[PDB]
Amino acid sequence: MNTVRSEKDSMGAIDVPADKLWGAQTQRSLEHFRISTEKMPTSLIHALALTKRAAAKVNEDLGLLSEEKASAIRQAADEVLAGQHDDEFPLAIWQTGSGTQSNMNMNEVLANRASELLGGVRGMERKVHPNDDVNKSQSSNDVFPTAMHVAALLALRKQLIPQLKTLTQTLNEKSRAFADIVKIGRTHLQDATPLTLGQEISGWVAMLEHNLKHIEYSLPHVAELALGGTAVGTGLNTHPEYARRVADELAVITCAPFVTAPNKFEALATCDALVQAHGALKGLAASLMKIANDVRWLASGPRCGIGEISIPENEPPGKVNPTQCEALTMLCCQVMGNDVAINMGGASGNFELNVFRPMVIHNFLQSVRLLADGMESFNKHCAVGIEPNRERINQLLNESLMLVTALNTHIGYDKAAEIAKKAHKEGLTLKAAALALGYLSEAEFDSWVRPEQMVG
Amino acid sequence: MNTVRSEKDSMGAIDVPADKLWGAQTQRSLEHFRISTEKMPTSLIHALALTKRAAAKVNEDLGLLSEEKASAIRQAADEVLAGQHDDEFPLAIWQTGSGTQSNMNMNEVLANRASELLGGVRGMERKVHPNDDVNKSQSSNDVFPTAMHVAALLALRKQLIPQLKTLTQTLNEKSRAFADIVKIGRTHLQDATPLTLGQEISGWVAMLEHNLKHIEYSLPHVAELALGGTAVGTGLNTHPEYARRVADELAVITCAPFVTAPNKFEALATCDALVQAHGALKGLAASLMKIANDVRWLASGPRCGIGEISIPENEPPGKVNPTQCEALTMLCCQVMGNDVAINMGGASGNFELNVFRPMVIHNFLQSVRLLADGMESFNKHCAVGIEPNRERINQLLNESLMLVTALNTHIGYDKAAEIAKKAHKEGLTLKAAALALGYLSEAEFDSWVRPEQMVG
Amino acid sequence: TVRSEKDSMGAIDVPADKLWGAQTQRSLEHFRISTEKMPTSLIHALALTKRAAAKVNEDLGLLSEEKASAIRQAADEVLAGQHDDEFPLAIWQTGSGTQSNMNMNEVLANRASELLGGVRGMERKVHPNDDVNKSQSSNDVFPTAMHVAALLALRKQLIPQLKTLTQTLNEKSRAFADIVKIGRTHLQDATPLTLGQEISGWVAMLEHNLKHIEYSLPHVAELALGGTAVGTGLNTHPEYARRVADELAVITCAPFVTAPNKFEALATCDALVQAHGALKGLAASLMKIANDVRWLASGPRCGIGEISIPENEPGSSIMPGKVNPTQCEALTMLCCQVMGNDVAINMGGASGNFELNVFRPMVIHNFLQSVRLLADGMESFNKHCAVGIEPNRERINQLLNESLMLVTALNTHIGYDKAAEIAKKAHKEGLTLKAAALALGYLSEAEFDSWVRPEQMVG
Amino acid sequence: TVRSEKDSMGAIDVPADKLWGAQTQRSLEHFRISTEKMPTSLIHALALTKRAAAKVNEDLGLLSEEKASAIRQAADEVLAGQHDDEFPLAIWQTGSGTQSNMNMNEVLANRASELLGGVRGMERKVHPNDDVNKSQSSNDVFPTAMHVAALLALRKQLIPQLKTLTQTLNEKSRAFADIVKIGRTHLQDATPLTLGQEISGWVAMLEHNLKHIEYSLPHVAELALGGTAVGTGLNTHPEYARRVADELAVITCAPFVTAPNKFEALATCDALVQAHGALKGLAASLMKIANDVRWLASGPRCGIGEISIPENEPGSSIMPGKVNPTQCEALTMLCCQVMGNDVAINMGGASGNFELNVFRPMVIHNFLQSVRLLADGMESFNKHCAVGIEPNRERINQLLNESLMLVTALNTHIGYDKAAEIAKKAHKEGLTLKAAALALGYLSEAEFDSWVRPEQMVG
């Protein structure tokens, strides 16, 4: 739309698009921070709306906000949460370091929309006011960190942890299914003593179980909310019950165990909870990288690699590219880079406020999307369909030199070592070398060399 | 649109939206890699279209593609470059690690659209074919690295370097404007011997000049193109002149000095040129971080910080938050994290192909957008308006202890040191301490203690 | 001056006055890379692992009492600092740590032979592989030593120093609980808080970090020993893995347990990737605290200057009062180091293949360095800086009261509009808030002193 | 056994048998952090900087000939390895490097005094600040020593080793130019190329890296010396900065120049952030090359096994043919280290304030470590692995010809459809391409041998 509406703040008037619900401060941010393409993610917009909805409820409870205004603000916020206003949040990640401008974006959109819901209009004649009403009892300095932790905790609980559990269950099923398939071990990339395919997969399972525990340990700190610390952490200009009440209300409307931060100075001056929680996520990325690499190397072929397993072929001779493994290894690199950006932002607070916050939460929520969706994708498009190539597994095992120790108790170490050395030097199987030396019969070799007895 | 069109590839048929121009392989990628929200950036889509346009021209020159088809493909590509088809490229960064699926996305969209341009239709009855026509003489393995370098070199030449030069010029103007304003030095954050504000700013200028040179040194390697190496670098199934011809044609239509890579194995197996070029970008990020921090610390106040300079106040007592500095310091952290992701991807090639490519170019082009747009924003909304607070600069200088050495040649080191120690112990100015001891008159102090003689 | 030792590749000359053997000597000619060697903590953890393995092997009837006792005595000599020069190998060796495993096997075998009345060298009475390495692989020994060194370093160095620094800052927070100062957000003047409140943020950060570090300890306490080459424990007694974890727990007094999944224990460094995540969290917190301290102490005249710190280095007599915050500089530098170390660790931890992660010397080099840096850095910062933090009460009050931030105390007395008018005239004309108020006749001097109370503005 | 030395804080006991003074002794009690000290390269660069400053100060008539000569002689003793134990200070010190600057001033002053027939200690004839530090600040000395050490290490260690490894791999590429092998993309069988072509990719990578490293050298050659405390050169001779850069260029034979902007030179570590960017590029290239080598050598029976590498470590007689790629492991580990070091450097380089970057000991510790790792790692990988790479010609040909990838050679002879039909039956039934072709009667044995030529499929 070309037509404009004049919106005002303490700096003066500025034109906004007539068909939009934001106000003067959103427009100034939009115009002054035309930096790349990264915007607040929907999860964070929703967390800001939840924060305003909770603040409106508590302000009404405390007699600070009229029922009529509080109810209209909560209705406007519910419209945002229902996906009706995604285009009303146009601001960049690369804005003021406190997130003030996105706080004001929510204040302006909710105020203009709440005014409409009370039979009023958007703009200067509005019935509901962004600062006096929607931002009542609040500062950008405690709202934006609150929205960061609300978005982060809900994403971990509702997306990442469920997908981690699902992938773990699938691989546990595979470990059980393949518990009796003996295969060659590999250490240093070299043929090594055998283990079962189920044992190898049980390592992946145990990795994902350990990662879940580490991620769970990080959740209580992310559950601490800054809301109520206002500008510098003292809670100046708040009711003494407000901080506990608004954390309780957020816990009610999200069904997550939010609590008010016991030290609001730590809560405002740092992103420490997110630095620590992302430490657990980069641990998961290192684990998933290893699992994804094992899968694609074991599936490599079809004839000039390892080829011990097959994976589902999802996108169009015999060349099956392990594309889910590639997407997953790529996003694991991304999580490692994101951790460095977060660490720099988290290390860079000054005095009463950390002002690297849009960048920190942009990276953090991206890592959660990547790991959650990446595990979901890898599970349904790869892991559920992993199958052994039993003939190839057996070919590699039986043509290796690593079953030779099964001969020791029968013919002695010295003759067994002689057989292995002859096989290696002359390019023979262990059986052919042993027969050539006359040290055993073929029936004895087949009776004695039992891989299923060599895996514990 | 709910209605579908059936599109086919070697795997079978799949439904695509009837109002879209992509084909079966795009649809499979869209459905199989629902991972987060990051998609190919427009710069990369354009670079893929340029690559197809150049290949079509050369294939026609070599008698391998009919004029009618080549002209229609180039027309379709020009529509993409003109911004008419942005919604036809729906694929995620987190796809196959070669970028095959986005290569096929361009092949399918250009083929379906070129078919329409020849009076045909989109879909299975098309007159122009994604693989046989649009991908003629090509592999995903040399197309996607080519598009990576085309996008990267053009972004560096057309966005980043011009904005770097502009910011450098502004700060050079400020350095000249403030060449005679003496201010207190600060080392270790402690008061130190003086320098002029122009000298201090000249350090920022020299930093940006050095960064431009480092960035320029990285451009020749990015200008090397993989196109013509086909699947593994040998150029099997290409005309012997094709690699040089298509690099020449890309140089023509982009006005940039693209050349064919002298070693196609290095070009396919690595992202080394981008690892190195991003090394120069993280150098620029470290420089810009320092410059941005100097600006916001020198502007800090209005009464309880340093306050030696003022900056433009762009968004609404006396509290001017340095929001451009905050956006810039945040994106500098992002570039550092992006470098780690790129380094991991670049270190992780195997044999004939590096398959971490969508992630590498996603990070690289993001860093270029952030640095280019961040410098553009910081320049126009902050740097052009930096002004000294001359009274505050002089207050700090004259009330410091650091002008005392101007007394040495007049009264001797021992008396000058005595004056400084008395001033420090008793909370006096140097002048008040010197007068209290009777070692000089006020006229002598004012005549002898000349900061403009202490800066070289 | 040299003796001839042998391994399966043949004979090689070894310095007669050293206790290592042929394989260690070979490693010295093949891995001459930079200057970083195994740290003493890791050497000690390797000796503890061999000491425990010998005890359990003796318990199970696999190793004779005289050999097991001599191996334990030689290991105790290593732990007692008698053999630091017997471990010359680079970090940059075989990625499983085989060479350092064999270094310990050879030193302990040659020394145990002497303790039994024998000699070092090929006539030795105790044998590096058959005796000192019995029931073991390099594959499960080296990750065991990694976790023993890591857990003990966290328990015995880092966590005590973290608690000590926290207690110091908690005392400072209480001592300065009533000192009102100007807040700063975005580096700009902001509403007040007490110096004690500000320091209480630092304290809460260190308390949270301690919890995060504690959460990482159970996984590090899981030991690979008993998984042998690929995790199956082939050729080992079924009780060996539990017994050797129990023995390590006894002799170290730390809660070591056998890893419930030996394949995860051999194929990854996941416990250390996770534990180092908590350490880089502590580095980001310490960076912030150290930066607050040095910015608050900046000056003495052209910075903030709200606190003083101890002056530990000599200055020039003509520059009295220049106090560089050198403890803050050492601490912020090592915090950068921990962030870089984390990336190296993450790359190594992401890079296991199949049954074994072979990035292990590098991973543990970084991890133990970060622990030394953080533990020693916290000790140094505490002793030489934090214990001596003092307020500059006159400067704090000058900044607070000459600022514009106390104007909101006038709201409920003369309304928002009059108070704003006071702040703008003070700013515009360079006046104090009281001056711009008296000049506009909006209150008397006594009303200002009564209404504008910073001690009533900190919650 | 001790002597009493003094600085402006008073007297302190110093070991009588050491050459440092009061300030170095104080640093030893205040910076007891971890184990990392200044590396020898940096100590030598500091001694060279003092040697050059003394020469120029003598030229300008500021320092007596006998003192300047004695200082230069003492510096030459440091360069000759006679005083390594006189530099005990941690990396984790004052962020300007003041303490190590004073360490060199005190050692050279005390030793120069002895060379003049005097003694060490407070009766010395040569004075650490007035003589050895004349015309200098820690602020411009330490960045000068950083760049001297960095440039010389790149010129004298890293670049020679890079060239040596490149030449070895170039010889291997030519030697194996006619050996056709199976390509691999996405880890999957792909169309053929020669082993020489594959190795030529490694060579081209190392050649490109050399160019990138060379591009970083001019900025590192810019020296801060002459900027003194804040960059203005206050209290220095107008020719001093050029003269001392010229003198360093003479005595090192390297193209040092005075930094054209001393404020950039003092306030940043930008040259080293940029130069380390090229080193992490080399680390990513070396990681890839090392991984190709160890994957291509994997086996001996259940991996790829296309090449053999030297076996440098002993194995077990019952496991012949297990050759761990231990040089590849050391090299990939140190490449991870370089990536982490880059992050530490970037954080330090981003963190200057106003006139001085005070993250410098940490920055140069990382930078010089990366140079040692890459130079020594390339030397080790070359000598103990790359020079011995050989093809397993039978295995290469087995993989190539038992694969499905040569089927496209049949296209122009029997059409696309028949060739595809051959590949699918071979895959479906586990046949060779020739077997599935003869079985379907689409060609004779002689037509297959004539048509399917891998040596005609590599461009």
UniProtKB/Swiss-Prot annotation, chains A, B:
It is found in: Cytoplasm. Changing residue 188 to N: 200-fold decrease of fumarase activity. Substrate binds at residues 98-100, 126, 129-132, 139-141, 187, 319-321. The record marks 326 as: Important for catalytic activity. Induction: Under conditions of iron limitation and oxidative stress. Gene3D superfamilies: Fumarase/aspartase (C-terminal domain), Fumarase/aspartase (Central domain), Fumarase/aspartase (N-terminal domain). Disruption phenotype: Cells lacking this gene show an increase of biofilm formation. Its main location: cytoplasm. SUPFAM superfamilies: L-aspartase-like. Transmembrane segments: none annotated. Thermostable. One of its GO terms (molecular function) is fumarate hydratase activity. The keyword Lyase applies. Optimum pH is 8. It comes from the Bacteria. InterPro entries: Fum_hydII, Fumarase/histidase_N, Fumarase_C_C, Fumarate_lyase_CS, Fumarate_lyase_fam, Fumarate_lyase_N, L-Aspartase-like. Pfam families: FumaraseC_C, Lyase_1. One of its GO terms (cellular component) is cytoplasm. One of its GO terms (biological process) is response to oxidative stress. Belongs to the class-II fumarase/aspartase family. Fumarase subfamily. There are 2 substrate-binding sites: the catalytic A site, and the non-catalytic B site that may play a role in the transfer of substrate or product between the active site and the solvent. Alternatively, the B site may bind allosteric effectors. Homotetramer. This is Fumarate hydratase class II. It comes from Escherichia coli (strain K12). The gene is fumC.
UniProtKB/Swiss-Prot annotation, chains C, D:
It catalyses: (S)-malate = fumarate + H2O. Changing residue 127 to N: No effect on fumarase activity and essentially same conformation compared to the wild-type, but appears to dramatically reduce binding of ligands at the B-site. Pathway: Carbohydrate metabolism; tricarboxylic acid cycle; (S)-malate from fumarate: step 1/1. Thermostable. InterPro entries: Fum_hydII, Fumarase/histidase_N, Fumarase_C_C, Fumarate_lyase_CS, Fumarate_lyase_fam, Fumarate_lyase_N, L-Aspartase-like. It is found in: Cytoplasm. Its main location: cytoplasm. Disruption phenotype: Cells lacking this gene show an increase of biofilm formation. GO terms for biological process: fumarate metabolic process; malate metabolic process; response to oxidative stress; tricarboxylic acid cycle. Substrate binds at residues 96-98, 124, 127-130, 137-139, 185, 317, 322-324. It comes from the Bacteria. GO terms for molecular function: fumarate hydratase activity; identical protein binding. The record marks 329 as: Important for catalytic activity. Keywords: Allosteric enzyme, Cytoplasm, Lyase, Tricarboxylic acid cycle. Involved in the TCA cycle. FumC seems to be a backup enzyme for FumA under conditions of iron limitation and oxidative stress. Catalyzes the stereospecific interconversion of fumarate to L-malate. Homotetramer. This is Fumarate hydratase class II.
